[PDB]
């Protein structure tokens, strides 16, 4: 059970979290105590920040906004069901609280950005015909312009005329 | 959207935006005139950092009679249905991505332009 | 050259690159405009963001996603660095990272009309 608090700001934050958990009546079907759960989420936020400053108020407002998101009712259901414990929900990022669709979109955009920023591997004909003089491996790539050869293992470069 | 310049009605100078500090509403006053006209757009200024611009707005239909320009028979018009269409890349310098082809219906009184 | 395990995976070498490549707002911003939305909750651009956060004018700056994600940036640090950079004359009601549009709303509180353009520029 969350400890009782005498602080007016903390009491208002608990009430607003409980009101966010009531959004869509999912708490009735689950039979979760939304007042107790709102109190535990607030208590976990307060244990991290230990002050009622703008950082604490911003953190509580972010959680209320994510619980009230009409595009992500599953987050609120998962919190009410205890799949997300109150302490974890009190630490989770705006990325981890996002809808599964928005998470997958961000993951795809991040993967595409990484792929676009990968330098093109220098082209040429891969061959085992050439043995590298430094590492003695046969993994080489050649190009003719005079045959230029690069070892793919040690980066050693040489030419044949 | 944007905002245009709306010119004063008396001096035909440029109206600057000014807040009505009494009624709390955006006005457009003049520098030289004392002309206060009531805003509607609630916007001062915009700036497309993306530099996203639709080229089809800039493509003018007269390009179809350019002999210098490649003609396809591989994309027909949509309004009339002409077969002939000239095509080109975006001549605008903002085109490092846009090798996309813009097509113009080669049929007078149509000038339908589209991008595939 | 990369010292840590980052030397191997392109993923944990990428964040070093993001921590090195000079990235100002112009790189992740898309469309910057101004509005004399007479109240924070007036929300003339129709937004529900300030109403949960509950000047007669604001800077609105809808940022880019595929540019902000590619840098692993967030509105959190952007707003922090804004407020730290210009001091608490500026308040930034940033969006959330669930919405489709990545708006920042910026206002001043305590020659002003041009001044939002002056600080944005
Ligand atoms: Zn005038
Ligand atoms: Zn046509």
C54: in domain: yes
Experiment type:
cryo-EM
B3: closest chain C residue by CA: C33
C35: in domain: yes
Q: What is the CA radius of gyration of chain C?
A: 17
Question: How many other C-beta atoms lie within 10 A of the C-beta of residue B58?
Answer: 12
Tell me how close the Cα of C76 comes to any Cα of chain A, in angstroms: 9
Are A124 and A150 spatial neighbours (Cβ–Cβ below 8 Å)?
Answer: yes
C97: in domain: yes
- Regarding chains A and B, contact by 3 or more CB pairs under 8 A is answered as no
Interface membership of A67 toward C (CB under 8 Å): no
C69: in domain: yes
Beta bridge partners of C60: C33, C105
Which other chains touch chain A, taking contact as 3+ CB pairs less than 8 Å apart? C
Beta bridge partners of B38: B27
For C19, residues 6+ apart whose C-beta sits below 8 A from its C-beta are none
Residue span of the structural domain in which C24 resides: 6-121
- Torsion angle of alpha carbons B66, B69, B70, B75, nearest 10°? -50
C91: in domain: yes
**Among residues B7, B1, B96, B97, which one has the least CA distance to residue B47?**
B1
For B57, residues 6+ apart whose C-beta sits below 8 A from its C-beta are none
Please work out, in degrees rounded to the nearest 5, the angle formed at the alpha carbon of residue B24 by the alpha carbons of B22 and B29. Answer: 80
Q: How far apart are CA A91 and CA A45, in angstroms?
A: 7
For residue B38, which residues of chain C lie inside 8 Å, CB to CB?
none
Domains (ranges, CATH) in chain B? 3-47 (no CATH), 48-116 (2.20.25.10)
For B20, residues 6+ apart whose C-beta sits below 8 A from its C-beta are B26, B27
For residue C96, which residues of chain A lie inside 8 Å, CB to CB?
62, 65-66, 69, 94
Tokens of A143: 């190009």
Count of CA atoms in the C-beta half-sphere (13 A) of C11:
4
CATH number at residue C116: 3.30.1360.140
Q: How far apart are CA C66 and CA C68, in angstroms?
A: 6
Which other chains touch chain C, taking contact as 3+ CB pairs less than 8 Å apart? A, B
Q: How far apart are CA A12 and CA B5, in angstroms?
A: 48
- Torsion angle of alpha carbons C44, B6, C113, B48, nearest 10°? 70
Question: How many other C-beta atoms lie within 10 A of the C-beta of residue A63?
Answer: 23
For B36-80, give the DSSP string: -EE-SS-EEEEEETT----HHHH--GGGGG-TTS-EESSS--SSS
Helix (H, G, I), strand (E, B) or coil at A123: coil
Domain count, chain C: 1
C1: in domain: no
Is A114 in Cβ contact with C14 (below 8 Å)?
Answer: yes
For C40, residues 6+ apart whose C-beta sits below 8 A from its C-beta are C50, C53, C54, C93, C107
Helix (H) or strand (E) holding A4: none
Q: How far apart are CA A146 and CA A105, in angstroms?
A: 48
The phi-psi region of residue A120 (left if phi > 0; otherwise alpha if psi is between -120 and 50; otherwise beta) is: beta
C98: in domain: yes
C73: in domain: yes
């Amino acid at each position: 059970r969350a400890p009782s608090t005498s602080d007016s700001v903390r009491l208002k934050c608990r009430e607003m979290l409980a009101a966010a958990l009531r959004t869509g009546d999912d708490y009735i079907a689950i039979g979760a105590d939304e007042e107790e759960l709102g109190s535990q989420i607030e208590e976990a936020i307060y244990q991290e920040i230990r002050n009622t400053d703008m950082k604490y108020k911003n953190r509580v407002r972010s959680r209320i906004s994510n619980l009230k998101d009409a595009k992500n009712p599953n987050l609120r259901k998962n919190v009410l069901c205890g799949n997300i414990p109150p302490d974890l929900f009190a630490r989770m990022t705006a990325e981890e609280m996002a809808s599964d669709e928005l998470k997958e979109m961000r993951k795809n955009l991040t993967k595409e950005a990484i792929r676009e920023h990968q330098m093109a591997k220098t082209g040429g004909t891969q061959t085992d015909l050439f043995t590298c003089g430094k590492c003695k491996k046969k993994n080489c790539t050649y190009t003719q312009v005079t045959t230029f050869v690069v070892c793919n293992e040690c980066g050693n470069r040489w030419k044949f005329c | 959207g944007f905002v245009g310049i709306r010119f004063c009605q008396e001096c035909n100078n440029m109206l600057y935006p000014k807040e009505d500090k009494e009624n709390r509403i955006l006005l457009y006053a003049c520098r030289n005139c004392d002309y206060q006209q009531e805003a509607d757009n609630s916007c001062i200024y915009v700036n497309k950092i993306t530099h996203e611009v639709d080229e089809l707005t800039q493509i003018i239909a007269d390009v179809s009679q350019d002999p210098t320009l490649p003609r396809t028979e591989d994309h027909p018009c949509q309004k009339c249905g002409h077969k002939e269409a000239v095509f080109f890349q975006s001549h605008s310098a903002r085109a490092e991505d846009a090798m996309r082809l813009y097509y113009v219906c080669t049929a007078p009184h149509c000038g339908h332009r589209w991008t595939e | 050259f990369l010292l840590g395990q980052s030397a191997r995976d392109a993923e944990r070498a990428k964040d070093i690159l993001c921590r090195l490549e000079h990235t100002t707002l112009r790189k992740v911003t898309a469309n910057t405009a101004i509005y004399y939305d007479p109240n924070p909750q007036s929300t003339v651009v129709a937004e529900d963001q300030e109403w949960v956060n509950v000047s007669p004018w604001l800077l609105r700056v809808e940022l880019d996603r595929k540019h902000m994600t590619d840098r692993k940036l967030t509105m959190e640090q952007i707003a922090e660095k804004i407020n730290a950079g210009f001091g608490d004359d500026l308040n930034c009601i940033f969006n959330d990272d669930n919405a489709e549009k990545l708006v920042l709303r910026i206002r001043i509180m305590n020659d002003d009309d041009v001044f939002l353009r002056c600080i944005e520029s």
